[PDB]
């Protein structure tokens, strides 16, 4: 009936002065815009159908045409930025916000979905959706005693749309909008559905990706222990944003980093630092690097949790991106650590894998490793054990690598390598 209609036929039906013909043609457009291979979104836009679909959103007297036009517009808004813009330019934002209060759950959900696509386009459309007042009716749909009474798909779509209102930077979402959403986000983070948990974690990872003031807003809501719990989840779509959020929090103050340690996050790192997913190992090692960039008592917690052998491990063998982050973790540790802590790092076998990485064709990793060597030598100078370290670097073929770096293209590498040879290998 409404299957495989041409755009011309859809236009003829929508341009008729018959509500039922308009409904049948709108359903036909929805089905066209719903096909798996190449939906004709641009053809529907060029035919001038977006203003007609937006006017159909306001037809309270005909709920099926509201649903069909909301679905058609959701499919257009899910496309390119230009396609989303066409939906916004048609006046769809206030029309979709008005549909959030609809007595029909399938229409309200379609309006939630459409607004998530519009807000997800970027900062400007996210902030425009907020200015049109979407946050209050969206939050009202979740103002229930128990989230378990809501339909699964309905809750998943609401969580996803709220996460897009938390997403993007330059600028980050408005402070008052973040404050308004956060109590509902904390509640969704304690829900039992894995898709709700994944998207709630993604929302938290976006909000913590910024200055310390942004991290503070989140950490003050007491979510860090729940994030550490999710960091231990078996589902990879939950662990990925939970680790991103924890990794973002430890870029903050020493006090914000301490809340992550206090919640017991370091006990999860033996498995994260050996995770079969390279991106988990990489971001776990980045997280570790920001913790070793902290206080000496925080470096001590890394030691006590037996995580230094795990850092020796990732430095020895891992994908290059993880090895670069491991090099950073070692340089941060050696910069802020005590002599005893630096001595412990050498005893765990850090020298040989640190030297083997000097062969890498990446100027940044060479600079970072050369800095770590200098810091380890500075500790050895305080104990008068520089000779023991010089022999150790010579034996694993590290001397041949530093000597070769004296003729390197980079200025900082050339200067640092010449300094180490003149001070400890002459």
């Amino acid at each position: 009936g409404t299957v495989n209609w041409s755009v011309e036929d859809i236009v003829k039906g929508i341009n008729s002065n018959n509500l039922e013909s308009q409904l049948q043609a709108t359903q036909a457009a929805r089905k066209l815009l719903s096909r798996e291979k190449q939906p004709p979104i641009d053809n529907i836009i060029r035919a001038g159908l977006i203003p007609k679909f937006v006017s159909f959103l306001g037809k309270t007297d005909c709920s099926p045409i509201q649903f069909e036009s909301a679905w058609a517009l959701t499919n257009i808004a899910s496309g390119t930025s230009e396609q989303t813009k066409a939906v916004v330019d048609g006046g769809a934002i206030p029309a979709f916000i008005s549909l959030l209060a609809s007595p029909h759950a399938h229409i309200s959900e379609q309006a939630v979905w459409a607004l998530g696509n519009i807000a997800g386009d970027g900062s400007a459309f996210r902030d425009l959706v907020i200015k049109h007042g979407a946050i209050d009716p969206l939050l009202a749909l979740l103002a229930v005693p128990d989230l378990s009474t809501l339909a699964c798909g309905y809750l998943r779509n609401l969580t996803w749309t709220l996460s897009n209102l938390c997403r993007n930077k330059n600028p980050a979402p408005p402070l008052d909008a973040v404050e308004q959403i956060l109590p509902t986000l904390v509640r969704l983070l304690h829900h039992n559905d894995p898709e709700v948990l994944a998207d709630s974690c993604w929302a938290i990872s976006y909000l913590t990706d910024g200055p310390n003031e942004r991290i503070e807003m989140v950490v003050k809501k007491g979510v860090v222990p729940q994030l550490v719990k999710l960091l231990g989840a078996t589902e990879l779509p939950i662990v990925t944003p939970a680790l991103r959020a924890i990794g973002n929090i430890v870029t903050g103050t020493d006090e914000q980093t301490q809340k992550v340690i206090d919640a017991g996050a370091l006990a999860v790192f033996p498995s994260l630092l050996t995770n079969p997913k390279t991106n988990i190992q990489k971001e776990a090692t980045w997280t570790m690097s920001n913790i070793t960039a902290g206080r000496q008592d925080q470096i001590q917690q890394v030691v006590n949790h037996g995580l230094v052998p795990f850092l020796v491990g990732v430095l020895s063998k891992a994908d290059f991106k993880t090895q670069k982050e491991a090099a950073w973790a070692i340089t941060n540790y050696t910069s802020g650590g005590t002599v005893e802590q630096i001595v412990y790092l050498v005893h765990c076998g850090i020298i040989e894998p640190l030297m083997n990485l000097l062969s890498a064709k990446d100027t940044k990793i060479i600079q970072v490793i050369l800095d770590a060597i200098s810091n380890i030598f500075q500790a050895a100078e305080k104990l008068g054990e520089t000779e023991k370290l010089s022999i150790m670097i010579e034996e694993c073929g590290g001397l041949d690598k530093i000597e070769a770096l004296q003729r390197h293209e980079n200025e900082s590498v050339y200067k640092a390598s010449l300094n180490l040879i003149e001070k400890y290998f002459s």
Binding site: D209, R244, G247, T251, W286, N290, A293, K321, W328, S335
Partner: peptide, 9 residues
């Protein structure tokens, strides 16, 4: 010595 996600990757 803290590095944000964009600084690291």
């Amino acid at each position: 010595r803290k590095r944000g996600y964009s600084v690291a990757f």
